[PDB]
């Protein structure tokens with residue numbers, strides 16, 4: 001009917017009606033909950049390849065209706081002409097093209113609708129770069145460099161998305177093969193161990209297998225692997241002066257900087273799909289700024305990532321014989337103190353998990369007040385350390401799928417037919 | 420489908436869940452909205468019949484006697500009781516099987532690797548609050564075992580018409596009192612302020628100290644609850660000191676050794692056991708993260724951080740995180756030093772992954788609530804964080820029930 005959420009620390013109760021506008025299956029049923037499944041559902045709004053008219057047009061009407069409602073038209077002359085324009089365009093090309101305003105609206109609302117994102121208080125402050133005129137990998141690389149430069153802004157980071165041509169028949173996709181624009185290589189060592197970042201071992205190897213000569217260090221910025229109009233991907237080296245990096249040091253442990261650690265300042269996800277009114281932008285790299293835990297809890301401490309916990313623990317002279325000394329927990333805190341201290345000292349935008357979660361609670365209040373709800377995925381909103389001492393831990397959330405949205409998509413190398 | 424797969428993204432291990440086909444009651448989610456983080460989303464004859472059948476069939480299957488002569492006669496014997504008396508009585512074997520499987524089925528419990536080692540105390544002959552007290556004392560003494568804790572449950576008479584319920588009004592058997600002061604401050608445990616007032620109103624004379632063990636408030640056969648003081652020599656306690664910080668013991672903190680939850684309802688075969696206190700042993704973060712460090716609890720976070728000379732001006736110093744770790748170190752060190760059973764969140768989550776994999780092997784699945792299985796601190800460095808889990812409701816089960824003072828008709 002109409003669902004309430006309660007915060008068990010403040011007793012604030014919020015009432016959700018926005019979920020009634022949700023279209024896609026979450027994967028749950030009355031009998032099974034899938035809220036901890038990474039990809040619970042395959043319910044897409046359109047089928048395989050180029051859809052028929054009765055498949056694409058109703059999705060397009062819905063988005064156009066939604067956009068003209070958002071600006072307090074709907075039924076206006078411009079709205080009705082737009083519907084005719086979309087209809088003729090689908091009739092004559094089997095697709096349609098978004099206006100600049102519709103594109104900007106759709107990208108912001110994809111971010112506004114991203115139930116897993118704790119950063120959404122910023123959703124309407126997003127710089128949209130229209131790259132729909134792009135035709136080649138070289139052009140994609142040019143757009144990405146300008147994105148990286150604008151978004152980095154000498155450390156005063158600015159949220160941005162660059163949107164490449166939409167999918168047509170599915171054999172002409174634009175893709176950024178990288179998962180993020182900036183990532184460190186991972187090297188599969190002969191003695192079975194791993195040098196660099198273990199997440200990227202496979203992609204690192206694709207790059208090598210494509211002709212990349214690895215410098216074979218521990219912080220090798222990977223090349224860009226860009227695919228335009230379904231052609232074979234091409235390698236490009238981001239100019240180093242565009243890749244802002246922060247040396248990790250600790251405000252008290254002077255031996256910390258001697259660990260020779262750094263991280264990059266710009267998180268820019270580049271393997272997701274942006275879906276607006278039935279159109280699918282398979283290359284839409286988007287960026288904001290880091291929550292400190294994303295580098296220092298996940299990027300340094302996952303067992304299949306950097307795993308430098310022990311060395312920080314060893315350097316801290318901790319009992320590592322048994323878990324009940326909580327040596328992992330102690331080192332994990334110090335690493336996250338160090339990451340934040342370094343980014344703040346170099347005036348690179350960063351947010352701690354206490355501040356980001358507090359902002360999200362505020363965003364939730366705003367969304368329920370003016371929009372009747374806010375989709376939120378508790379499993380992803382709660383930070384990976386110190387969860388119960390942040391306000392989101394005690395906040396009930398409702399998760400549901402609204403459109404426009406960002407969607408997962410398969411890595412292109414499982415799909416690509418080379419030439 | 421016929422199968423559902425769950426993946427561990429750290430180890431790549433993939434398990435196949437067929438057990439969820441046997442879940443019969445709701446999760447609260449719908450096909451279009453997930454309620455995985457909502458905390459909480461008498462039977463007629465014709466209602467009781469199929470629920471009893473399902474449970475007896477399940478029990479006779481478990482003992483490899485399905486379809487047997489004893490199975491068919493038990494079935495017939497149950498239907499006659501339902502027909503004649505509108506209820507039925509579990510055999511002792513079924514009671515034990517039911518209690519153990521309600522724990523096995525508890526999707527929010529990370530401790531379930533131990534489920535088959537549960538001491539079941541049958542208290543269905545109890546008739547008065549005094550009798551309940553006697554049963555609960557023996558439970559406490561048995562489970563505590565001088566620090567070598569043993570899990571146990573004590574099952575009081577089932578619900579009949581809803582007007583004669585047995586209830587433990589306490590939420591746990593052993594909790595400390597909370598007193599709100601005229602100046603707005605709180606003495607003791609702020610989580611128990613409401614129940615503390617209920618006890619004082621029933622005549623309890625509070626010591627008005629910081630660690631007053633609350634009295635038992637016991638309701639038998641639907642009568643007004645009655646107060647009892649647990650004998651102090653039965654309440655094992657642990658003074659909290661720190662292995663490095665000399666000053667920690669000067670906070671004067673202690674905790675009780677035995678977690679014993681007493682406000683939930685045990686449901687077996689449609690029968691409802693409204694009074695069923697059960698106990699295990701602590702995971703350290705249940706005391707150290709939640710029992711001292713929720714802003715609605717003791718709030719020695721600020722005290723520990725002060726004594727640590729931490730920069731408490733900005734959050735980005737992570738003073739709260741730093742002080743939370745040390746309190747949890749102290750909790751574990753103290754219990755281990757006093758030889759009182761406790762488990763840290765790393766050991767517990769690792770054991771639970773082993774348990775889950777074993778349940779998938781022999782049982783076809785294991786329902787699990789990631790929101791609750793993942794510990795309240797250092798989540799991603801524990802192995803359950805990367806473990807996909809399926810949540811569904813099997814019966815027998817433990818269920819929430821409203822506080823008895825909300826619905827009780829005072830005599």
Ligand code: HEM
Nearest residue numbers: 111114116117118119122159160286287288289290291406
């Ligand atoms: C501006 C500062 C931002 C912060 C601090 C932030 C924070 C986060 C974090 C911590 C996550 C979970 C990541 C993890 O732990 O693995 C997340 C997820 C996500 N963010 Fe944001 N974010 C920001 C901006 C943005 C922007 C600009 C977009 C797109 C326009 C975006 C879209 C998303 C999406 C789609 C997800 C979920 C992806 C998935 O399903 O896996 N975020 N965010």
Ligand code: HEM
Nearest residue numbers: 522525527528529530533570571697698699700701702817
């Ligand atoms: C013996 C060691 C045990 C350990 C270490 C353990 C651990 C835990 C923990 C940490 C939680 C989450 C509590 C919270 O974070 O607030 C939990 C929940 C739970 N435990 Fe266990 N437990 C144990 C024994 C038992 C026993 C013996 C039973 C019943 C026979 C039981 C039934 C439950 C139930 C029903 C819940 C969830 C309650 C709810 O729905 O809110 N546990 N357990």
Ligand SMILES: Cc1cc(N)nc2cc(-c3ccc(CN)cc3O)c(F)cc12
Nearest residue numbers: 116267268269286287288289290291294
């Ligand atoms: C825009 C933005 C900023 C930020 N600071 N962080 C993000 C993290 C993610 C994410 C990445 C990878 C995965 C899967 N490993 C899930 C995510 O939610 C994302 F998409 C966008 C982010």
Ligand SMILES: C[C@H](O)[C@H](O)[C@H]1CNc2nc(N)[nH]c(=O)c2N1
Nearest residue numbers: 393394395396456457458790791
């Ligand atoms: C809002 C949320 O559902 C609630 O605060 C839950 C979250 N997960 C939890 N997990 C555990 N183990 N214990 C809890 O008390 C809670 N609280």
Ligand SMILES: C[C@H](O)[C@H](O)[C@H]1CNc2nc(N)[nH]c(=O)c2N1
Nearest residue numbers: 036037379380428804805806807
């Ligand atoms: C199994 C689990 O659902 C999965 O690993 C999720 C859990 N929650 C997460 N939360 C965040 N923020 N980031 C993650 O990668 C994950 N991983």
Ligand SMILES: [Zn+2]
Nearest residue numbers: 028033448453
């Ligand atoms: Zn769900």
